Symmetry: D2
Subunit: 424 residues, 4 copies
Amino acid sequence: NRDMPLDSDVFRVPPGYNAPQQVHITQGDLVGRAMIISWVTMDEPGSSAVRYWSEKNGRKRIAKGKMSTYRFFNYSSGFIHHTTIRKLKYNTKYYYEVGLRNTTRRFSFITPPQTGLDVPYTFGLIGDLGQSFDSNTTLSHYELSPKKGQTVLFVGDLSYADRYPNHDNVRWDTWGRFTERSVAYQPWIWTAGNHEIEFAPEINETEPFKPFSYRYHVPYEASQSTSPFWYSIKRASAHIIVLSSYSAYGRGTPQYTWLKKELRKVKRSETPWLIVLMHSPLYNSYNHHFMEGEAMRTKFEAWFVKYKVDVVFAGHVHAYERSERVSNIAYKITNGLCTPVKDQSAPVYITIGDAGNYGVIDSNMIQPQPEYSAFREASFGHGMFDIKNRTHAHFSWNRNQDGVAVEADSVWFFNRHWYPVDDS
Amino acid sequence: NRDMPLDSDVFRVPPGYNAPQQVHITQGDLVGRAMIISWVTMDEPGSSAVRYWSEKNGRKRIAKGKMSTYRFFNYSSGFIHHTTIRKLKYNTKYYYEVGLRNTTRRFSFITPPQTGLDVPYTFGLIGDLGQSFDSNTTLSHYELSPKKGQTVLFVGDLSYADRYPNHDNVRWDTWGRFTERSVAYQPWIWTAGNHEIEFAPEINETEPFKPFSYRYHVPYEASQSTSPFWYSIKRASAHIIVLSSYSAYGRGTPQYTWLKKELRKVKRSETPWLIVLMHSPLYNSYNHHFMEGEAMRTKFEAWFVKYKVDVVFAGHVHAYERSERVSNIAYKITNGLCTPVKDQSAPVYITIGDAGNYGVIDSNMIQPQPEYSAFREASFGHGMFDIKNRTHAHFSWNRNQDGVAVEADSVWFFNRHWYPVDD
Amino acid sequence: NRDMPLDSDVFRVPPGYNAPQQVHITQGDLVGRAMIISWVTMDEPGSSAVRYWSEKNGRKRIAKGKMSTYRFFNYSSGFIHHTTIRKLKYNTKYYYEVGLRNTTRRFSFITPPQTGLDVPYTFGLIGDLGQSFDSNTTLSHYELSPKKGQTVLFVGDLSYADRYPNHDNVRWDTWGRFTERSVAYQPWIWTAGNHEIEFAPEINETEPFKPFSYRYHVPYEASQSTSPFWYSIKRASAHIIVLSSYSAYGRGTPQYTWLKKELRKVKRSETPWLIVLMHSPLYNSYNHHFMEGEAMRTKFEAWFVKYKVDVVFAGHVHAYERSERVSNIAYKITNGLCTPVKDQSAPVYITIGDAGNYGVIDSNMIQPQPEYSAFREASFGHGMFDIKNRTHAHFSWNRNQDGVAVEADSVWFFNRHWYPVDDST
Amino acid sequence: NRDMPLDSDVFRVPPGYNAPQQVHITQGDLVGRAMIISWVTMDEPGSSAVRYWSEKNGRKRIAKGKMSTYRFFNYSSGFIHHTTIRKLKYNTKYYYEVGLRNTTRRFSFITPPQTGLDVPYTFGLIGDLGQSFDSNTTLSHYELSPKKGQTVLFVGDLSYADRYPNHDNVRWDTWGRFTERSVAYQPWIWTAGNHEIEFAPEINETEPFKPFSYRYHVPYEASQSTSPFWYSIKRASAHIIVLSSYSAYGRGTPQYTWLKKELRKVKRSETPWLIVLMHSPLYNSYNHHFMEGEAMRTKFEAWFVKYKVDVVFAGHVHAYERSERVSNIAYKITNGLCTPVKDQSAPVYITIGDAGNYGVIDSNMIQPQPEYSAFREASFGHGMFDIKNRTHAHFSWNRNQDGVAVEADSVWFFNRHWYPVDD
Ligand SMILES: *[C@@H]1O[C@H](CO)[C@@H](O[C@@H]2O[C@H](CO)[C@@H](O)[C@H](O)[C@H]2NC(C)=O)[C@H](O[C@@H]2O[C@@H](C)[C@@H](O)[C@@H](O)[C@@H]2O)[C@H]1NC(C)=O
Ligand SMILES: *[C@@H]1O[C@H](CO)[C@@H](O[C@@H]2O[C@H](CO)[C@@H](O)[C@H](O)[C@H]2NC(C)=O)[C@H](O[C@@H]2O[C@@H](C)[C@@H](O)[C@@H](O)[C@@H]2O)[C@H]1NC(C)=O
Ligand SMILES: *[C@@H]1O[C@H](CO)[C@@H](O[C@@H]2O[C@H](CO)[C@@H](O)[C@H](O)[C@H]2NC(C)=O)[C@H](O[C@@H]2O[C@@H](C)[C@@H](O)[C@@H](O)[C@@H]2O)[C@H]1NC(C)=O
Ligand SMILES: *[C@@H]1O[C@H](CO)[C@@H](O[C@@H]2O[C@H](CO)[C@@H](O)[C@H](O)[C@H]2NC(C)=O)[C@H](O[C@@H]2O[C@@H](C)[C@@H](O)[C@@H](O)[C@@H]2O)[C@H]1NC(C)=O
Ligand SMILES: *[C@@H]1O[C@H](CO)[C@@H](O)[C@H](O)[C@H]1NC(C)=O
Ligand SMILES: *[C@@H]1O[C@H](CO)[C@@H](O)[C@H](O)[C@H]1NC(C)=O
Ligand SMILES: *[C@@H]1O[C@H](CO)[C@@H](O)[C@H](O)[C@H]1NC(C)=O
Ligand SMILES: *[C@@H]1O[C@H](CO)[C@@H](O)[C@H](O)[C@H]1NC(C)=O
Ligand SMILES: *[C@@H]1O[C@H](CO)[C@@H](O)[C@H](O)[C@H]1NC(C)=O
Ligand SMILES: *[C@@H]1O[C@H](CO)[C@@H](O)[C@H](O)[C@H]1NC(C)=O
Ligand SMILES: *[C@@H]1O[C@H](CO)[C@@H](O)[C@H](O)[C@H]1NC(C)=O
Ligand SMILES: *[C@@H]1O[C@H](CO)[C@@H](O)[C@H](O)[C@H]1NC(C)=O
Ligand SMILES: *[C@@H]1O[C@H](CO)[C@@H](O)[C@H](O)[C@H]1NC(C)=O
Ligand SMILES: *[C@@H]1O[C@H](CO)[C@@H](O)[C@H](O)[C@H]1NC(C)=O
Ligand SMILES: [Cl-]
Ligand SMILES: [Fe+3]
Ligand SMILES: [Fe+3]
Ligand SMILES: [Fe+3]
Ligand SMILES: [Fe+3]
Ligand code: NA
Ligand code: NA
Ligand SMILES: [Zn+2]
Ligand SMILES: [Zn+2]
Ligand SMILES: [Zn+2]
Ligand SMILES: [Zn+2]
């Protein structure tokens, strides 16, 4: 176990009575004019109000949100606040304060630009963060990146609190305080991983995702989803679809039905970059969780080809892997066509679940490297998906053992819709 | 299309003030000593009490249940009752009556024999019933069967009420009154199909399986399931595992985790017949819904082989198919091994979703007939799985266009644990 | 049984698919800038959106509210909509529309003037309305009154649906359609009466006021009440306090606590007319329900004197009665001081529970008329509290058997804070 | 504030992992064959099962109950268990054990005799107990009483936790542990006082009686009450009626309606002693809370007289008072009949809210002592209602300053139905 001890500086509780902690934000709407503000108070319920103001207009406003609590076995939570700030200005720095009654803590964010064809934007890519010492340097590598991530795409497995006895939910609080130094100033877009399931019938905890869902809200109604575990957002030139690997996705189910309709609503003339997130990779040549993505892949892979998804990000495997553009959609049971082929309409599949978890890397690879795998390496690190314009985005991967400006893997993406050419 | 009109005889309301209607029973425990009695009253809530007594020891006892209601868009249900009778005697006729506060109605059932290695038992197989005129013929054929079925293994898609505007839930009620003449007297073991999902955010109805789960209860806690849409029961010599094609089944999910534990609890020296029910077939050589079952197959086929499941029954496809014993579990992305192969540890996959639905048959088939497919036909009908003992179970398929004693398809199942020979 | 039959013209369903019916409004805030819009759709849920605009300007805005439903025994409601229009302009005609998805119906209201010392306003007084032919006559008299009532103060007992078998809640829907012609255009201020309680444990209905509270919302949180059945509103120059005779009011209970603080908040220099609404009369010389008000009188009478309430309106008794300014607050169990005395600091107690109910008047009164009873008469009718300014309000009582313009009883009120001179007739 | 400090011995936590604390029992049915067993586990949910057996026959049985939790402002409760043991034998000592899964604790109780005309029984009377050092003394005097109480009638105001900042509900847990040494072995019959209202809108606690209602269950369903704050039990020769001073009692309200019908069910030929419990006294000659009972009095006094209630116990005033048998029911507003008069159908009204509370006594009395007041004294203490038979019960008031066998006041109650003479 390489988890940071409870006394670590990154887990420190902010001073002052009922001081807000575990502050975290995410996009609150479909197009970027809104922000969910989230924090926890531990001494008393406190106010769910958020004071905020833009640098441009300097008028202090109040939004009012809602508080909630939960229990998990013998654990009882602090007071969890979720407040949505709406009708924000584009491309604008706002300041926001939480804890208006007790002790007040102040933060800030920048709204993205209005969606558009050539609007540039830099996405962090982080998966399977955890709270090990490895997790802490990955976060450091992200925040010190000269490419300056503006939003993190998070592909599942947050706190790993379920590894503890009875899923010791204090390790959710520590994770929230630890990640605050980033997510309180820029949105993370949440994907549900398997360590969020927390299905523990032995301790009478049988509602999947219960802790995760109380602590991390997503703007899922903004895209007509009926569940927080699959949803869409638009931000700058990107359309991002979040799927749930451990929800139902059979034909006719809510997630299947929502994805079918959502892929049809995508307007590549406004958001050229089509990004999909799921926890479990559909392409993966590591031994760890080899072929667990087969189920979802059979259901959705053809749809990713059809709609010319640019890239699919996943975690789950604790390592890094970048596919070639391939598909394996010709199979008809008896026709023998079960080998992935090069398909220039396919997305690139990237496994980036290597941000540290609890300190274990997945090293065992199937050998030789299969044709469908382009690059892979068992190192800790994080990714950046730097969109330049409608045709070009630059993806890079940074290792924890390198300098923060070093790119150990690096490739240009040519947009599938606006410039379809062999970017290999 | 061919759905029976609302004024059909099969849909008649039982007379009397608040007379119970849509009466139906199913196994109430793990081993067959309990029964869930269910019904609906339309005039007022009424009593959830059930009076019962055996034709033998004859003492009249009272079980008490719970009532509940639901709404669906602009539909308001009647008052739905579910009551469990426990501690029944094995292998005895009981009488039970419902509607004690006002109009009483009386029915009977016969508890199964205790579970055991060599206990014979006869299972009706019905899928995708619906309420078309074909639906009624299938049910007649089952009731007039010389085989004499004792329990219906129902592989999902019940009322087809979702085909109607706003899913007109009156068509649940009619289907309940139509099927009463069978399921009030012998258990139907319920599987959930895609027509039970009734996901309709356009009318703000977003809870999967809501009308079905209010109306049809299952003993799912008896097998430590956390959900009614997957569960297991034992009856005579059969261990029946019911799965939910339209719930989560990824690694670490409730259903995945439950099934993974459940197969370890199977004792073939106590129940040698291992039967799996699911709505969507894992092997299906018809064009309609072709390869829909692939996702669940990747997850569960290797377990079915590991545990030598005798048969997997499914509906969904509106036709009849019986596979060979095959598996397709050796694939590894790049090893190229993606062809089903004869495997005597594997189950036979039977598609039996041809009870009538709303009158339509699935006739277009993959050509040529793949080697994994033993027999297929686009006719309405039903199946019977007739366990003779620990080694032999006779499966027969009866067509609606045939006489009720006629088996258009017939095959001996040799038990995968006690007698695993080529069948 | 003088209840109007089900096929009466007043119970007619508004035509068109899923047309909104039982449209009714009431004040939706403390000061008058808000309105709660309420209505029922029978065919499908429909939209809880309200389109509205000022006759002056004309900008057509939308307010979104919520739909709820209930069951009561073997009855199932339609789809009940409550939507609050906020931030409105004072003294201004607004039009509003409901049923925006399918069949639209349009109505209007006038927001009250801004609260102030001399702001005039006419309040109607109706209690125990019911749905009888007498009930129809009272409503007609109210709306045809030459002094135009601008808001109804309603002292409880609405539909008398609970008199029917299984409280046949269909009789709630008919009463909503019948009263629509008034309450859809001007707010009625709701008090909960004993016929709202609907405690029917024999048919497993044990939640008091369940039908009433689903159908009739009030802005109780605006006055920091925690319950719909007691709350305060301010309108024009009146501060109106609504109490619940059939809720707890023992010392330390929520209603007791709320009323205690609420009287401290009243400012007679911003709203001179202090009005109390309750169902059960504290002072009542009628035989029916004689002394049922003693328990609440015991708890609150002295507070009404202390804070110089101008008038207490009640119903419950199916007749009309106006009291002298009278108090009975000096009793100490053993001191013999149990008789009401003239007290110019006390309010007037008015029983106005004679709008019709199910067609029965309460005529058996105690004789001779006690010294505390000013005027009493067993006839169907309604009242008007016509505030002229900070010092003067005219109260009048109109009988059904009389013309619409004739006051059978009437009296000038001298405001207890601004003109505290004896005004005894 | 004479409240005991948190490290006092009476607040000791039972040792051992998840040891049940705050164990307390009350009658679980109408007549005395059932017991509600309540306790709190702090380390994890634990099992709600209760193992119990009579000292007579060691046939160990299991009763299964229910667990609940609550929050109050920034306080989070432990795991609260309520389990009803039903179908017990009369007049029988039972053992019971809680904390089965982890640390077990064992207690006992003795069921009352079957209800009956001439069954003797001793009732402890305790009100406004709290947790001062005075409170601990009163509880000692009760448990040391030579008259040996068999059940406590508790007229309300339990923990006084609502005097602490934010009603510091730890002072509920501490009170449960302190009272356990009595109430784990014999029932206390709970009346809600005003310190149970805990209506605190400032800190967003607006639901009356929430902490109390979670921690202390009552068998209110057994008398067809729809609310735990009013209810009746029958025990030995007593029919006991608990009213809620701080709920609704206007005409038509649930409580009012309930009391009207419950009195009609009283059978003095089976329970000759008719006893009413309420928190706020209807007769009180103390300055503190003078005439707060008038409102309930105007509604209910004539009913008490009409049904010849033997005695009404209240608390609320932190002193002792015993009235004469008087009524004040002749008043008609204008007839001037407002003075209480002696009335041999009226109950005796006893204020017994002097068990200690937070260490304050109410000493200021109305002078001179009114005619309706028989005896009254501002001292801490408790009472005992000792039923001998259908005609006689002995009531005694024991002060904390006297020795445990000393009665500072004592009267014979002559049964209003069987023996109504001037007592
Ligand atoms: C969209 O972004 C691309 C990456 O930044 C642009 O390509 C870049 O163009 C630069 C000239 O402005 C040149 O120095 C860079 O080397 C080049 N980078 C790459 C990776 O090609 C692209 O510009 C167009 O496409 C390239 C290939 C050249 O033909 C440019 O002259 C073109 O303008 C950007 N597209 C647009 C429309 O600006
Ligand atoms: C289990 O049931 C099978 C079907 O009823 C039995 O096989 C049948 O046995 C009949 C005589 O008992 C024979 O006429 C049938 O032809 C035969 N049916 C088939 C499909 O083979 C079976 O009986 C045992 O197995 C058969 C093959 C013979 O060897 C019998 O002598 C055996 O008793 C039943 N198994 C047992 C263990 O009884
Ligand atoms: C406040 O309203 C009162 C009721 O309308 C006014 O009294 C009425 O004044 C009328 C002409 O102003 C007069 O014809 C009415 O007889 C009289 N009504 C009564 C019941 O007295 C009152 O006007 C002031 O007071 C009265 C007594 C007259 O002296 C008026 O001339 C006064 O202006 C209104 N108060 C004010 C300040 O206007
Ligand atoms: C009910 O209990 C009372 C208290 O014990 C009985 O009165 C007591 O009877 C004793 C004789 O056994 C006697 O020594 C006690 O002094 C006397 N105590 C009092 C306070 O009176 C009572 O006994 C009957 O009633 C009284 C009025 C006498 O007439 C006795 O002689 C009677 O036996 C008991 N009543 C019954 C019906 O048992
Ligand atoms: C985590 O990293 C930050 C930034 O590099 C550093 O200040 C902090 O001390 C580190 N803490 C631990 C426990 O590694
Ligand atoms: C609740 O708040 C009080 C005062 O703010 C504090 O002293 C106490 O420790 C808190 N209790 C809990 C359980 O947080
Ligand atoms: C359904 O089948 C039964 C039995 O064959 C028959 O009596 C009945 O008339 C049929 N009803 C319809 C509508 O086909
Ligand atoms: C409810 O029950 C009453 C009494 O039998 C009956 O008259 C009425 O029609 C019923 N209403 C409904 C909607 O079932
Ligand atoms: C239904 O049964 C109850 C209880 O026996 C009875 O009171 C009632 O009148 C019955 N209803 C009808 C319509 O017969
Ligand atoms: C539900 O709506 C349809 C029209 O959309 C109507 O025909 C049907 O009768 C409605 N059902 C009820 C119970 O109102
Ligand atoms: C009600 O309106 C909706 C949307 O405008 C429409 O789809 C529906 O057909 C309408 N219903 C009827 C009965 O006209
Ligand atoms: C009710 O009164 C109105 C007049 O205001 C009249 O038009 C209508 O016919 C009356 N209806 C009944 C049933 O009395
Ligand atoms: C939960 O149970 C474990 C069991 O060892 C214990 O150590 C832990 O302190 C408990 N947590 C709480 C908050 O009681
Ligand atoms: C309470 O009383 C008991 C018995 O008299 C005694 O043993 C105990 O120490 C006392 N505790 C306190 C804190 O007074
Ligand atoms: Cl009181
Ligand atoms: Fe992981
Ligand atoms: Fe089907
Ligand atoms: Fe009335
Ligand atoms: Fe007290
Ligand atoms: Na599927
Ligand atoms: Na998976
Ligand atoms: Zn994972
Ligand atoms: Zn299907
Ligand atoms: Zn009334
Ligand atoms: Zn008290």
